[PDB]
Structures are given as structure tokens and as C-alpha cells.
Ligand binder design. Sequence first.
Ligand SMILES: Nc1ncnc2c1ncn2[C@@H]1O[C@H](COP(=O)(O)OP(=O)(O)OP(=O)(O)O)[C@@H](O)[C@H]1O
Length: 1182
Amino acid sequence: PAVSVLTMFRYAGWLDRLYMLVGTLAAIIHGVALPLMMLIFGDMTDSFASVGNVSKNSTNMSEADKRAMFAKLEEEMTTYAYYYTGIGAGVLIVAYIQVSFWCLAAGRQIHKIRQKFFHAIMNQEIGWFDVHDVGELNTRLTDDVSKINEGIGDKIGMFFQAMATFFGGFIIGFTRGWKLTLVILAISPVLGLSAGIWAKILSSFTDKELHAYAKAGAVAEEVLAAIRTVIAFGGQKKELERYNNNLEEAKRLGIKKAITANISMGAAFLLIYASYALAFWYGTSLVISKEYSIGQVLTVFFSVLIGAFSVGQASPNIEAFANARGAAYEVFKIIDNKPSIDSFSKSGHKPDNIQGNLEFKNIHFSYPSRKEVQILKGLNLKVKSGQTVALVGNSGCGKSTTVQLMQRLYDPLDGMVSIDGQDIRTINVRYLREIIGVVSQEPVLFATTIAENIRYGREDVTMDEIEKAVKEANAYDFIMKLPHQFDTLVGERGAQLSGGQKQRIAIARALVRNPKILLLDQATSALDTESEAVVQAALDKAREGRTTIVIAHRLSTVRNADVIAGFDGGVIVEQGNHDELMREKGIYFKLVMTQTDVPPASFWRILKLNSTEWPYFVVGIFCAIINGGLQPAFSVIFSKVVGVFTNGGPPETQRQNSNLFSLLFLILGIISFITFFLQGFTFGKAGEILTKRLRYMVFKSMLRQDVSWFDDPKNTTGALTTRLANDAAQVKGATGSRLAVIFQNIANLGTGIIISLIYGWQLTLLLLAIVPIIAIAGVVEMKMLSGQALKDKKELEGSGKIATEAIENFRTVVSLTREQKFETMYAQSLQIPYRNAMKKAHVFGITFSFTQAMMYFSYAACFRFGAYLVTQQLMTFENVLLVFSAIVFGAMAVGQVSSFAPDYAKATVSASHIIRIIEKTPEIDSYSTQGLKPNMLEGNVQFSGVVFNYPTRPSIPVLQGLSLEVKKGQTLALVGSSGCGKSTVVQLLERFYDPMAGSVFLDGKEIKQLNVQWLRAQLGIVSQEPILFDCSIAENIAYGDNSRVVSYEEIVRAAKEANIHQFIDSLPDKYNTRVGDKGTQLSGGQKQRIAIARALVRQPHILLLDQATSALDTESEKVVQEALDKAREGRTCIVIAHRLSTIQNADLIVVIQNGKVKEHGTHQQLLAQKGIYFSMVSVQAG
Ligand SMILES: Nc1ncnc2c1ncn2[C@@H]1O[C@H](COP(=O)(O)OP(=O)(O)OP(=O)(O)O)[C@@H](O)[C@H]1O
């Protein structure tokens, strides 16, 4: 959808309504300013044509004909040169006003939008945030606001310019003779038609492509997330073929786009060369009959094509304006939306002497994300002033909902909530929340100082009072131990505070507010019994004589409360003191007892990647020379035409010369269509090969890498799918397409420099001296349009980061009632990109003005100097046109080439990354073929003094002097405090990493000397969260022993021994059932048993079990443990043990602490040791 145009320019002050008006009048002038440059150019050839044939045919006088005609041209061209400079003078003024006033008026409007849009979001309801996706909302603050500034800025001034030329151009064409124009305007619908057809066919082969690679690029994403399972089971080649057998689809489809894109080029490049002749063949016949002059035609043919091409230059300026209307709809809706609970209004009462009488009356309530089911039904309950009320009951009974209604974050439907006899929906929201202290489940700390985070509760508090509150909250002594005490910087940027310390800050914040009512919703939940005790002392302190509602999770909180309400299904089944509810032996009694990147890759290296198809490259080079030569050809055939009618000739030859040269256009026009159809058929396949061949070599080379690579923060599973998907394809704009450019550019400017130099060399050294100037200008505009894009958009990140901090914790700030503070913080940050943008339009006023002025001025500096060369009989007027339209129309050709081809800079660095991902050789070559691979199936495992550090964060040491044997067929349990040391042993026997020092042996043999495939083939990885692949049960299981004959019989025996056979045989589509996200979702317990079943098929001599049972499925757990006892029997086993019961039946236990084996032995010996191991078993008991 979109907005009405006249709405969208609201918030535009009267001065912005003026700037947009004055700037338009500039745009209209600048629009017609080039049609005038074509009209004069016509009247200039008339001045040359009138004398060009006098001095040649009849030799009447030698020096009385020289001065006669030549002092006429010298006086005619004084005016034509004064006329040209007059335009560029007016342009210089006009062009400034155009882009100045429009970017200004847009900027002035944006700054008024940002504040009104953010404030609109801080003014919304809390049920408003429930329905909406907050992620896209935050980007909508800086993307959609960035999408509007396009379609109200300078993009309008260019539109009214193009329309003033469309009508300004078709005006001049018609008044200078109507026959020539209606010829063209009969063909321009054929070209306005020809343009849109291909864009329907290019858009066709686009969306078909994103669904072609979506098959291949889906296998890619699944692997690189599941890389731990792929390497550990050696399926690194099986995944290469799946990714490849779907990779031919997007290739063949890539060719139908590659051909048809260069068809679209040469097809429309033909209809120009066709309609050139049709308009010139017919245009020459109207000067031969002495109806038009040569100056008349050359005006009209150009003055039409400019005005006719003015539509295609205004295509995107509309699309940017319609994108701006559309993005402006989602925003303006929010600004004009007004809430029922207005957090900014000043309406309700502000009652004083609030004792805290609390009353709920017949409350019913439904959330608006799931409104089908009611959450609370007929809920009634009073809290007497200064008493504490604990809410208990099972999950889903609206305990927090109660607290949300007393915050008034939703408005109940039926019933009434009153404070001291007064409807809470009849006082003001800010006074309400000012009297209420919110202790959330999780405390939000803001990325600011501790002083400010506390002062957020009440911005006028003195530093004396801060000290008092921090004391009362029990957070002072820990603050006294921090290095930057009350100035320490907290949040995501700063030092991470513990859970206990964060909550006490939230408590101090609420104390600063000194409210009359306190609300706590799981104040202590996550916190351990040690952290909880300090908070409880500080909570209890803060409550002393305040009316309190606490969502209680800990039994000790509930036992000392003055009154308990028991909730069940929205309904208070029993209310009383602690002893009553215990006496009742209802719901409450049951609860309380049970609980007890800048790589400089070279152009030559990239080119070598496509070297396997050099014959394709030779042809494309060849046609890139012809097509680069057709431009300077046209500069002749245009000149040689006009030469006849401007230098001298008999009207017997004006027919054959004109029609010949007029049909040499269609010689050129055909050769245009052929050389493009062939250029994009050889360089086209050369690219679509190159993508497909590099995605393979990459994805192959990616699975070759070792685990330290995939552990890095930069090589995440997404940034590799991107790198594997578009960066792999973006290379082809730097192999063949770069030769096509430079061979075109050489064959164009090369052969065009040569020709113009011989026909007259004086004019050329001027033009090829000035082309350097105007060529520079198109770059610095592209630079400073972009170099300024960073500056203005970098100063916005602070302005955007402020908003990000406020939306991401909206439920908090609204409870602190600091919606205004963050609004002000946003606005104050926005004052920098405002004042920068008000200088930006001043800048782009100039870069746009002095581009067109140095072009309109330099248009005079050529046809003045070139004219004096005809006075002095040094060059003909034909030879001027043969210089001018051989440099200029040829220099414009490289731009029309370079702007079509892919962004070369963006392609080289996009390619430089590909070469690095290919040329990288790992520390652990999984692909290799050497290694001992004996027939000795003992599996004696031995770690001796292994020392290892994670190379993601090598500053952290884990293991020091770790030495240990596992005897054949024994089970070894790893235990100790939480740490990565225990997990590391599994990764080293896998050989996912090498160790720094020490030695890992397998049956007396160094694992660095055994093939990585045959080390890992006899090792079973049982992951925490086992990865199940989108695939059949046979394939997910076959992932274990790959490249193997496995039939139906061998599958069933293994599934028995994992204990899943009986459950499998009654399910629908039994062994064929699709599992994954598309298929039946398996529980946590079932997935792990699949991982066990996969390990049984492999039948290894060693079993690595790592943190298995990472789920809560109670029955499955005993099923897993049964299946596990089966899987271990008479096998050498290494278990990372977290559960005490697993440890009891193990043959040997190792207690590890800080890299050090403090003790080890059988179960019985470690208990009687009465050491570390003893401590673990004792804590669970009591
Ligand atoms: N963002 C949300 N949008 C809509 N409804 C929600 C949202 N969050 C929670 N709910 C609803 O709140 C209802 C009651 O949950 P409640 O917050 O009372 O749990 P609780 O009592 O706090 O339990 P616990 O303390 O264990 O989380 C649920 O039925 C759930 O649908």
C-alpha cells in the first residue's frame, strides 16, 4: 500500500513549502536548458553550411573571399559562444538552487519525523508491543526513515527536471518542423514497448534463480551449523555431492539469464541504430528538397531524443518516490495512533496520602496475542494497607498478570481495580507508576554509568541520597570494591555484573523512586541460594512498612508472609496464613513438602580461475573489440553525412552519400546485435561455469578446514552461506566482463583517439585535456556522495543506539516512566546529523552545479576553438564533428559500458575472500589418505601430560599436565567442576584440535601418525543436542559408517540395540518417516537415542559420551540409560559424567580441577578418600 501524495508532505513548514517551490523553478529551467543547447547547435551548422560551400566550388576571390566569409563566421560564432556561456552561467546559479532547496526541505522534514516517530513508539500500549515484531520495528526507525529521505530530497528536483525536458524537448522538436518528429514518435512507442518487455523477462529469470539455488543453499546451511557432526562421522564427502547434485540447476538457469540479458542489450542497441537510419534517411530527404536546413534536422533529431530519453531517466526517481510513499505508510500509522492508556497525558487525579488499600473486583482478562482463551476469570482479592501478599499456584494462573494489571500495563475487560476506593483507570498513569516500584524477573541495566542507571528512577536526586539508597539496597560494599566506583560503566559495553549485583541495582533504583506500593515478579528465581540470601535481606529491608505484592518462587519467602493467596485456574481456591493452608492440606500443602576484511587480490590471479575456458575468452575479446569499434565508426558516419550538407558538394551526390552512410547505420546496427549476442554467449557461460566451479571448490575446501576455523566468530554458519552463495557468484564481473570492458574501452578510445588526431590534432589536445577534467568530476561526485554517506550515517548510530536501548527494554522504561528521557536523549543526539545535513545540501548544491557548468561552459570552449580552426582554413566543419562526436560520444560510451557492468571493486574483494577460503590448507587435513591404519583392534587409550588452549581465545589456559590411561574394555568417567577441560578430552581423541604439548597415544601409537578418518571412524560422538538431519531415518543413521553397502538387515539389528526398534515398528510410514522440521518433530529424548543408534552401527572399540541427557524427559532418561548400558557393554568407554548415578557403575573415575587430576579411582575408593569427589555426592543428599 501507499500514502496519498498530499498527506506525505505534512510536517513541511511554510519555509519548506517555499524551498520546494523555488527549487522546482530551478529544476524547470535546468530541464529546458539542454534543449536550448541543441537549438543553438542547429543554428550553428546553418552559419557554417551557408559559407561552407561558397569558398570551395567557385574561386571568385582569394583574399576578398577569405575576409568576407571568415569575418562573418568570426562574428557569428561570437554570438553562439556568448549564447552557450549564458546557459552555463544560468545553470551554475540554477543547479545550485535546485538541489540546495530540495535536500534542505527534505532534511528539515526528516528531523521533524524522527522525533515524532520515536515519541509515537514510546507512547504506545504494552499490548501494542505484544502483537508486533520488535526486531523489524527498530530497523524501521532508521531504514524506513532512510527510505523516505530519498523520495523527498533531490530525487524530486531531478524529476521535475526530466518532465520539463520531456515537454520542453517535444515542444522544440515540433515547432522546428513536424514531419521529422512524428516519424520518431511513431517509433518511440516501439522502444518504450521494447524497454519494458525485457524487464519483465529479466525479472522472470531472477526469482526463478533464487529458488534454484535455494535447494543447494539449504544443504549448505544445514552442514555448516552441523559441522561438529559431519567431521566426527567423516561425511565430509557425502555432503559435497548433495550440495553439488543440486548445483547444476542454478547453472542452466543462470545461462538463460546470461544470454537473454545480452539479447536485451543488443536488441535495444539495434533499435537505436535502426531508428537512427530511419530518422536520418528520412531527415536527409527533407533537406535535399530544401524544406529543412541541416541545422533544423540536427536540432529536432537531438531535441526529440533528449526529451524522449527523459522518461527513462525519470523511471527510478518515481520508483524512489513511490517507495517513499510506501515506507511512509507503516510509519505515519503509528504517529496518528493514540492509546487508551496514554503514558504522556495529564488527565487523571493525583491523589495524596495514599495508604495502599488494594482491591481486585471480578477481574477477567485476556491477552491480545491469544485472545481465544481467557487467562483470568472472576478473580477477587483485597490486600490491606502495609500487608504483604504472596501469590502461589501452578504455571499459567496469571500471577504476573496480576502485577501487570496493577502497573496498568493492560486494561482488564470485566471488573474493576481500585486503589483507596478509586478506580486505577481514573488516576494519571505517571502518578500511578511513580507510586509503584517494579522489581522485574530479570533486571535491565542500561549502558550508562551506575549513577545514571540509578538516577533513571528520578532524574533530580542528589548524590547524598544515592549513597543512602545503595546502602539500604545492600549494594554499597560491592560498589566500594569496584575500580571506578559510582562512575563505573555498566551495561553491554562495560564490566559484566553478577546476577546478584544487577538485581540490587534494580532495588536501589526502586528505593530512589520511594514508592508507596511495591511489586515484585520473581525477584529471585535464577539466583542461587547464596546470591538469593543477600537480595532477600535487602528486599525485606525495602518492604518494611510498604504494601507489597510478591510473585514468590522460594518457599522461605512465602512462610514469613502475612497472607497467602492460592490461585488455580484464575480462581482463588483458598486464602489464609501459612498455617491455615498447611492445615487445609490442599494445593499449597503439596507444593511446600515435595520441594523440601581488506585483501588485495590481483586482477591476474582472479583471471586464472576461468583459465580452463580460454576459447570462450578469445571470442569474447574479439567481439569486445568490434563492439568497441562500432562507436567511432558511427562518429564518422554521422560526420560524413553532415559533412556533405556543411562542407560543399553537388546535389547529384547528396543522394548516394547520405543513403549509403544512412544505411551504414544498419550495417553497424546489425553488427551491434551480433557482437552482443556472441559476447554474452561466450563470456556468459564463462561466468556461469565459474560460479558453479568455485562453489564446489569452496565448499570442498570448507569441509577440509579443522574445527578451530568453524569456532572463530567470523566464520559463522551464515556468513559462510553468504560467502558460498553470492560472493562465489560475484567474481564473474572481474574475469571476462573486465576484459570485455577494457577491450571495448581500448577499441573505442584507442581507434577514436587515432582518427581525431589525423583529421585535426589541435582540437583533440584540447578535448583530451578537458576530458580529464570532466571525467574526474563524475568520480568525486560518486565519491563524495558516498564518502558523505558514511559520515551522516555514522553520526546516526549513536542516535540509533539510544533508541535501540529504549525499545529493547520497553517494558522496563515504561515502568520507570522515563519515556520522555530517552526521547530527549534521542533528540539531543540527532542535532549533529541535522546541522551536517544542512551543510550537505550546500555541498551537493555545488558538486551538481559545477558538473553541469563545466560541461555547458566546456561545450563553448570546444565549438569556439573548433570554429576558429575553420576561419583559418586549418580544418573543415565536417572534421570538427568528426573530432567532437568521436571523442565525446565515444567517451560517453565507456560510461554507458562501465555503469552497466558489475561493480568491479565490489567484485574483486568479493573474489579475494573466495581465494582465501580455497587456498587455505588446514592443520588437520581430513581429506588426506596417509596414516597407519593397522589391524590392531585393542584400543588402549592414553593421555600423557596433554596441554591445550583454545585458539579462539588462547589467552584462557584450560589444561596443565593431564596424564591418564584407559584400559581396554573399561569405562572411564570424567568429573569435576564446570569447565571445558572435561569436554576437551573428547575433542582431542577425535583430533578436532592438536595439543600444544604432551602426547595423546592410541594403542601405543601417536594419533598425529594415524589417518584422521581411521582415528575418527572408530570413535563415536554422542553430542549434547544431537543433530538430526532433514532426511530419511536410513540416511541420518547411515551418516555413521559412510561409503558402505548397508542393507535392511544391518539397519534393524542396530535399532534393536539402541532400544528403539519396538517403538519404530508401530509408527506410520515406519522406517520411511521423514524426520526434521517438515516431518514429525521428535522429543529431546528420542533424538539422543538416534545418536546412540548411529554409534552402534559403526561398532567402534571406543565410545565417547559427552554431556548426554541434556533434556528433562523423565521416562526417556531411564530409557536412554538402559540403551546406554547396552551400548557400552564390553567396550572401552569414555563418559563425560554430570549425573552422579552414571558415575557409580563406572570402572574408573577421574576428578579434574583446573587442568589437574586431583584424584582418581573406583567409586568406593574416591568416597573413602573423602576429598573432592566426596563433596559432590554429599551435596545432593541433604
Ligand atoms: N508476550 C505475551 N503475549 C501474550 N501472552 C503472554 C505473553 N507472555 C505471557 N503470556 C500469557 O500469560 C499467561 C499466564 O502466564 P504467567 O505470566 O501468569 O505465568 P507465571 O504465573 O509467571 O508462571 P512462571 O512464574 O512460572 O513464569 C499465559 O497463559 C501466557 O499465554
